[PDB]
Design a protein around this nucleic acid. Sequence first.
RNA 1: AAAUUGAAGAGUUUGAUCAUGGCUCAGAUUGAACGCUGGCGGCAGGCCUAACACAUGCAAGUCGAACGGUAACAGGAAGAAGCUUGCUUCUUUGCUGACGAGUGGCGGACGGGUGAGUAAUGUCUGGGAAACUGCCUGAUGGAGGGGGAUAACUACUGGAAACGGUAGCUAAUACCGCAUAACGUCGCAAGACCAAAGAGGGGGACCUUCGGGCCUCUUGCCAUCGGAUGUGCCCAGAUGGGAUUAGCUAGUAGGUGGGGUAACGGCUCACCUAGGCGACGAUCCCUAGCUGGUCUGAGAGGAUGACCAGCCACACUGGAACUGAGACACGGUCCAGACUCCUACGGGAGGCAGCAGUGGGGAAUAUUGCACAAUGGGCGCAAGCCUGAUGCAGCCAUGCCGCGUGUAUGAAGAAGGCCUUCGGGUUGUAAAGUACUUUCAGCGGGGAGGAAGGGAGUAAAGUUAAUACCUUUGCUCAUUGACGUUACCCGCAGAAGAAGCACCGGCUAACUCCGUGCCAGCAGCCGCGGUAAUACGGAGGGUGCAAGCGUUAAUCGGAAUUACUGGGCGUAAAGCGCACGCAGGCGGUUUGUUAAGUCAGAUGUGAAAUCCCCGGGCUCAACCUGGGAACUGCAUCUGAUACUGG
Lengths: 71, 86, 205, 80, 56, 62, 82
Amino acid sequence: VKAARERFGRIVQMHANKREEIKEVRAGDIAAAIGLKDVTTGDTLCDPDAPIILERMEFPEPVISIAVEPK
Amino acid sequence: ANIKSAKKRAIQSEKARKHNASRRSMMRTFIKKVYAAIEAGDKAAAQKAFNEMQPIVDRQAAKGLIHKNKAARHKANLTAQINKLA
Amino acid sequence: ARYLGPKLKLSRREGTDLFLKSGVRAIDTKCKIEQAPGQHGARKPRLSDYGVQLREKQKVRRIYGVLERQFRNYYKEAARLKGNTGENLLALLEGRLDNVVYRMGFGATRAEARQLVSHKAIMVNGRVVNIASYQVSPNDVVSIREKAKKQSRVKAALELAEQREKPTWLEVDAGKMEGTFKRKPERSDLSADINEHLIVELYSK
Amino acid sequence: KIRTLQGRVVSDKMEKSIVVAIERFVKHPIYGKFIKRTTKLHVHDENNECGIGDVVEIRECRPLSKTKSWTLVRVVEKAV
Amino acid sequence: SARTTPIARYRNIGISAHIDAGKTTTTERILFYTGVNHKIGEVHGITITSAATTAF
Amino acid sequence: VTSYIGGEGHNLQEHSVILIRGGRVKDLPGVRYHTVRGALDCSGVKDRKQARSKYGVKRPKA
Amino acid sequence: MVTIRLARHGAKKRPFYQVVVADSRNARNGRFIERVGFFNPIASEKEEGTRLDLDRIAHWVGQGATISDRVAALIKEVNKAA
RNA sequence: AAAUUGAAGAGUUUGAUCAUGGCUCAGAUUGAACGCUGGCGGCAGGCCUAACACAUGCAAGUCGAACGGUAACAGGAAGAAGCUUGCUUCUUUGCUGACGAGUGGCGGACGGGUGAGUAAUGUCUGGGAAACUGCCUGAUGGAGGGGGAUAACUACUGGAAACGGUAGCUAAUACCGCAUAACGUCGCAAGACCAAAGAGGGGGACCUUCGGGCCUCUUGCCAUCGGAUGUGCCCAGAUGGGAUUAGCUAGUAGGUGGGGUAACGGCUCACCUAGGCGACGAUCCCUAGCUGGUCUGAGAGGAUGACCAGCCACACUGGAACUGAGACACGGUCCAGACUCCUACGGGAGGCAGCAGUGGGGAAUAUUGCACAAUGGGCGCAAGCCUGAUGCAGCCAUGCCGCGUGUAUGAAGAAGGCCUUCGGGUUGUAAAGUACUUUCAGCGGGGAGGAAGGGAGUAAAGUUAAUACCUUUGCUCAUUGACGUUACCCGCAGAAGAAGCACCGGCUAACUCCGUGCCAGCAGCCGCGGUAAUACGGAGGGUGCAAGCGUUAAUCGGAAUUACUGGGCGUAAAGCGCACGCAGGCGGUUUGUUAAGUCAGAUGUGAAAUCCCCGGGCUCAACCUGGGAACUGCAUCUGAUACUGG
Ligand SMILES: [Mg+2]
Ligand SMILES: [Mg+2]
Ligand SMILES: [Mg+2]
Ligand SMILES: [Mg+2]
Ligand SMILES: [Mg+2]
Ligand SMILES: [Mg+2]
Ligand SMILES: [Mg+2]
Ligand SMILES: [Mg+2]
Ligand SMILES: [Mg+2]
Ligand SMILES: [Mg+2]
Ligand SMILES: [Mg+2]
Ligand SMILES: [Mg+2]
Ligand SMILES: [Mg+2]
Ligand SMILES: [Mg+2]
Ligand SMILES: [Mg+2]
Ligand SMILES: [Mg+2]
Ligand SMILES: [Mg+2]
Ligand SMILES: [Mg+2]
Ligand SMILES: [Mg+2]
């Protein structure tokens, strides 16, 4: 999506009583990565050989707008 | 201590401290008795105390609780003071 | 690390032949030597004291197909070497391998000489080298791998070799296509049309 | 055989001790002018056989005090 | 290396509902039932859900 | 300090977080620093395709 | 413990060892006492790859030094091949 | 032979000139940052800020061939044989291949990190005397005989955890006497006293109490005197700035004794004297690790102290010691202070300036990787085990070096763009086309070297009683690689996938056109822009560099612009208003002496690396490396005596 090159590592799974390091992630699974320099929701991280984009993403448009000043 | 080695060294050093301090405490007493005899002005008892204390420092020097030169200093200046007095 | 642009604009800039083409046709027939490149090249401006020195350095760099980093290294080496830096620099530029490959007749252009040396087509004393900056010592022999010995381009360059003047410091044998480097040539071997002290005047600024 | 320094005594008030001033000429590191540099030393002197301005021969020795590491060898001239 | 659990076995599900329908309670109970199921097999802890979790 | 913004037009305003560099502007007394166009909040000059690196302009495809 | 040791200099993947007398309580390329010889396990096989002054080695071993396993392999090899 | 033999200027004050004088630029260099762009490889480098706080994992263990033992897994004999086909082999015991915890030994004081503090309990150079020193060495000799404890263990039992608490039991190379006592210690001598530990391998005659006795080999233990290495101590010189810091000091300065340190010493104490330091800069204040070295410079100098190596100092902060050969101890102890964490609220735990990594600060500096394959370290007889030292791997154009992104031919010279006096030129062999090539990148195959060693043995020699055990040297055998799908080589096909950045007024190499019109903007300096802008913005063209190109930051150079080399003071900046005069600086001329300065020679040192010279190996280079030269600096001896000094 952002046409950029990143590297994985430090993948982690949740086990409801602990969080466990995992070396690899297989198809059909959910995993969390750490230390990704530039990655956002709806971004397709895929194999370098094939640059694929899967259905992009859909975001609800904002409905309440306010002005924030630090004070 | 966060290492088994350091833990073991702690207890070993504690025993060594107590055990070595016992020898040091018992040793100093004889020198103190000789020094007390010095202004006590005794003649037989001064040498008696010196003869009783000169061997005890030698074991300490041998096992290294003190240094042999330290023991030499103790006995040398003590006998110098006794020869001065008696 | 290489010039991929036109090869006659360089010669037109200095108004003199650079031997950047094989020479099948005449240079004045193939381009306008006396006119500099660009729409203003008709007009002849005034070259300052820095202008002439830069002009000579930039010329020599096109004759010998080198870049500024290597050429400054060559200048520093020649300055460090005992003797006269002016010729010492030329001696190093002669010792450049693809240069002697050109000189002894394996290439009508130093560009094609570099092309050949790059593809393991040249070995020295048997050992194959692909670095065009390879420094050649006296009493060294060069040849071609049996694969590239069948090439017609080297054969064609062979006839141009004796058409041009044979260098003294090189001894060749076109029979089995092998040459030998007698000794580094002194100053008088190369054309006096290249001034040498302009280089040292430039780099001693 | 033994090393040798010679100076002038400047203070003899201290009991069994003296102060010896050593003067030498050194070329200036920057300008080259020769300037005289002075070092003063506290020298052991038993029997107090030194005065003021008397030229003195000293020798390096054991540290005999906090600031004394030198002893008299000979005194060459007296009562200037 | 080799896939320990066949891909068909995997179930990627999400618990969704209206506010206070009991979504957190159900996820916590599911996690407890899986933990007890795989702990009793050996024997005759603080738990937090936060993001997506795994269970057998 | 006071900094100069080079190039044709700019998109800067209050509470803009920029990265200034050295360089004195002779005509404006008191100004001794430049604004690095194309870094952080500062944007690249629009329509400037000569000396682009001077103003943080990506190469336009052509 | 005075020992005979090898200090690994040279570019990586092409070692070059300096055979030197040093103290056991110092780093490999750290403070030494005095250089003895060198070793090159990537020698050209046409130029010598092991120079080693046996005189100072003998002096030091008689003095009470310790020769390392690699150095011993070198003493043996040089004393046999030459 | 060879080893320092090397030195450029330009713009800018004026109507114009000369001078003075400042500012700016042309050159190298970086631990760089950013902007644009970005193919490969080799080598190197990679938090300069917050010595800011730290989650998580590893970074210091080993030795059963020291000792009581066997918790756990594999056996050995037995065994109800658990068993029925002895098919299955369902109990038992350190009994041992081995070994958790425990005592004990050694190591943890090395290796690694950082530069906060320190202007000197620091570093560099040269000297010394009053010292100690584990392991590795060399020699001389001893290694005899006992005793009392205790861990682990047992019983009970407290605790959430951390960890314990009472009562018995058990050894040792743990502890302690006793014997012995010298080339050891003390003492002028006579004289007095000081230590030890055993453990593994095998064994001919004898051998019971089957455990032994004895014999041999290896190793360990004790004392002394050595060597080496390491460390402690002292002296001299040197090693930033400030006088808008001139007086500073009371254990202070010395002495006599006493104590103390391994050693000398106001180290320390009691007296006694009245000192001591300072204008040759004391004291006080700010800053700062120091050196070899690095950058620059013709040099003299200037700046600097990343990486590599030596030394110092520090380990949350402030103290304090203990053990230990060695610490006042990064991953040890105690106390205090600040901070953080766990908890059952009853109480506990910790210190990444180790390797990674996190947050934060910043313009900015990387992976919670692999291997102990090699060197090295610790322990062990060895095998081995540990080693975030080290070797390697990953990211980063951060620097240097190398190489590619094609080669040759190819004309009215295509199209199109640009300008154009409409004649043309222009981009331009440039393109198109035609022949050749595959470096690199991909594919499949082959393929060294970093690997020495160490095991199962096999032979030979020494050792004795031994053809045993062991020690030393050849031979056979299986082998030992993290990097790694290594470097390198081979065949495939296709030019196939690989160029950008800055500048063009002068300095300074590169010129026109079009927009605007003192606006928009450029600019290092001088200066450009008010209708023709070679200076702004665009295009074309050209120039200079190139996987880099520019800007910014910083140092030096140019700058003889702090002038030692090598400047000035009448008017440009600069002679105190004048005089006396201490300190200081300098000083007529001869005779003798000394040799302080000066010079010569020698000797020792000036760590290695770096630099420079001649050579070697990575295909060359970067890079690595042999030898030299250099490190002219210091000390000490011997002289020389013209000059300066006495
Ligand atoms: Mg390059
Ligand atoms: Mg409701
Ligand atoms: Mg919820
Ligand atoms: Mg802070
Ligand atoms: Mg500091
Ligand atoms: Mg420690
Ligand atoms: Mg730590
Ligand atoms: Mg770290
Ligand atoms: Mg471990
Ligand atoms: Mg300057
Ligand atoms: Mg200067
Ligand atoms: Mg002047
Ligand atoms: Mg004036
Ligand atoms: Mg006057
Ligand atoms: Mg005067
Ligand atoms: Mg005179
Ligand atoms: Mg003299
Ligand atoms: Mg060398
Ligand atoms: Mg050196």
